[PDB]
Amino acid sequence: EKRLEQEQRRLEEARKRQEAELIKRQELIKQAEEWNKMDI
Amino acid sequence: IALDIEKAKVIQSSIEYTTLKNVTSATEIYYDPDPTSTVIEEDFDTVEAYFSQSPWLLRLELDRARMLDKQLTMNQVADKISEVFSDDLFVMWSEDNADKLIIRCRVIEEDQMLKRIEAHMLDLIALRGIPGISKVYMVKHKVSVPDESGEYKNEELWALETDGINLAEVMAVPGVDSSRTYSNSFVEILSVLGIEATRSSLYKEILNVIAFDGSYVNYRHMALLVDVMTSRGYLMAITRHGINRADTGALMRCSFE
Amino acid sequence: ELAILKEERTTTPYLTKYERARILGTRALQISMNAPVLVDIEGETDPLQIAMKELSQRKIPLVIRRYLPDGSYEDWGCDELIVD
Amino acid sequence: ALEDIMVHYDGTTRNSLGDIIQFLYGEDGLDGTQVERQTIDTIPGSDKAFHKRYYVDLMDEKNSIKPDVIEYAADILGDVELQKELNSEYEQLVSDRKFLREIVFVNGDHNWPLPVNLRRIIQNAQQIFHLDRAKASDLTIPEIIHGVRDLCKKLFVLRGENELIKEAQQNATSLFQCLVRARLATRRILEEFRLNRDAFEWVLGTIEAQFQRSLVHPGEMVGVI
Amino acid sequence: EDNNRIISRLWRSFRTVKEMAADRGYFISQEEMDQSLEEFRSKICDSMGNPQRKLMSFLANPTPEALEKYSDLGTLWVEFCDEPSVGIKTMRNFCLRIQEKNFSTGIFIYQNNITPSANKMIPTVSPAIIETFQESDLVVNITHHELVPKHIRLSDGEKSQLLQRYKLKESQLPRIQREDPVARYLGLKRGQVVKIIRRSETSGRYASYRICL
């Protein structure tokens, strides 16, 4: 059970990191879409 | 696809190079001044049914047997000719139910020009398949794969072996395991997959040559040889043009050749 | 500069067969040229046999200098190299 | 083409210019004459056979070490720390099986030339110490585990405390360590070979010494060979 | 029909480019990595199904791990070119776009071929780096081949540690060409070292190093 708890903690940490990186990524996606619209 | 013979045959047909010359049985040139009719009585029915520029008629008869064997369509051949010649030639093709599969063409002193165009047609009209792959064979391979219980059990799978090499194009064909396509010409392997793949392929070829007659040579010797041949970033042939083009001492190099 | 300190010596601690052969040859030649013998000789007369007897007892007064590819070297005494 | 290539004192294989051909001769640093065909025991067989051969359970009585082969069979059942040690050993074995079966030898071939013949060493120990008879061994499980674990760290191909040197040293003996752990498992030692203590230290010392003797000698002209 | 196969090949090239950008250290969202073929047709193909290469251009920034390990990693701009043949004008305007938006690295994927004049202005785009790939050779990801081991670019500190450990000079390492397919996949610049961890039948695992040219 101790091993399972540690595994769950690490999984939650990884999930938080992925969410933060996705939040950062969406800004770049928006900028890219705006610039591609500008080129058109 | 590996475990199904029908899909494997479909892939084999899709890969092999086939040109118009492969299926063409004979070609002929006729004089016919009426674009809306013809002089030949045999082809008169088909052309009149179709109808319901230069007078020089260029026709050619396709072998029905091989045309069927290559799983081709008269419409496909006509479309290929039209694509390669745009609208510079008016093309009519007989139906599949005709006694002889024929296709007629017309230009929109030209006899020599027509002969040259016919030669070019027989030369470089590509119907389907990867260029450079002359022949393809179906081969059964025995592979030992762990079972659901972890036991290793033999298994038979279908694979293709070709004549001629085009690694980059064949790797891109859908239905082909692009992560395992292999060639016995490591120059192409170097041009496609890099230098480490060239090292592995070179070792495999050398081991194949040595071990064909049942002989065994320790791994480290062949490893050293293929590490020497590929240590400069490119294949260094074991000749004067490979060895003597190094930075070694002049006295050492002059003692060889 | 080029010499490597005794504490940082990283080569093998064993006497390679080439080093063993060269050491035996040099010691045999030196004995044949009337060098002092550092072990007691019972009844032996062959210089090579005396050299082998000296080597087995770690009494050969020679030093191996092992040259690294960059030019630096390590000095190993034949009395501190392990011999099979 | 290959004349001026020689194994140097740092283990690398270089030509006359000093250019590196290999970072370790034969990728393991061994001599061509000191290797033999051996079978790695963790590769073949079904999962059930592997589990039966290598797993040891100290809680279930009928899935434990037989009591007639060990003197201390009374105070073994129910121990949890010793079970932790056994579980670590079995996890190491499973990792070795996965590494060999999925990366190195995908086709499952398990007969490969490797240094120091283990079968010969074991039968020599059995003949030397008279390991016949139904006598019970006095070799405790922690001694087996710690001895094999320490042995797998004394197979020096490269000397030095550098981190990159340690990584190369660990890489150079992966297959051989897999072989050693496959042969010198706890269950196999206690049941199949029935070694006692003295035989066990003799086997460990012999393995280490023979491995040291099977390395390549600096100054080999391996290119000409 | 042929439109379907063209779209499929374009989708495969897009997936390969995204994988390449991920390998070089930049961050690509997991949802974008698994962006399937039907979604690609929905987003790119028009009413007649024709694709626009201009809608596929994207941007990426290095992950914190890659940024920490490699301090020279900037922003990456990847653009597909509509023109089947690229000339001096198109390369010049691409260079202008890179310079005005101060991108560290720009990848320019063309369709058929690149004129020699366009090739002659690639080295003069400093300090930004412009790398060109053909569409045909990106259909298959070569780094997923069986014969191709894993190449990892070494940082400057690791390269220094390597040269100190072996007491080497840069000319004494095994070499890898700059036009080598894996070298172009990793965007190797002259003087950089890749570590290759390789299968070995004598020791299991063997790590080799090569230096670019």
Please characterize this protein's 3D structure.
This is part of a larger assembly, with 1 copy of chain A (about 40 residues), 2 copies of chain B, 1 copy of chain C (about 80 residues) and 1 copy of chain E (about 210 residues). By secondary structure, chain A is mainly alpha-helical. Chain A is about 95% helix and about 0% strand. In chain A, about 0% of the residues are buried. By secondary structure, chain B is of the alpha+beta class. Chain B has a domain at about 5-130: 2-Layer Sandwich (Gyrase A, domain 2). In chain B, β4 (about 90-95) and β5 form a beta hairpin. Chain B is elongated, with a radius of gyration of 27 Å. By secondary structure, chain C is an alpha+beta fold. Chain C has a single domain, classed as Alpha-Beta Complex (Eukaryotic RPB6 RNA polymerase subunit). Chain E is an alpha/beta fold. Chain E is globular and about 60 Å long. The relative contact order of chain E is 0.11. The chains are: A mainly alpha (about 40), B alpha+beta (about 260), C alpha+beta (about 80), E alpha/beta (about 210). Chains C and D meet through α1 of C and loops of D. Chain A: This is Component of the Paf1p complex. Chain C: GO terms for molecular function: DNA binding; DNA-directed RNA polymerase activity. Chain C: This is DNA-directed RNA polymerases I, II, and III subunit RPABC2.
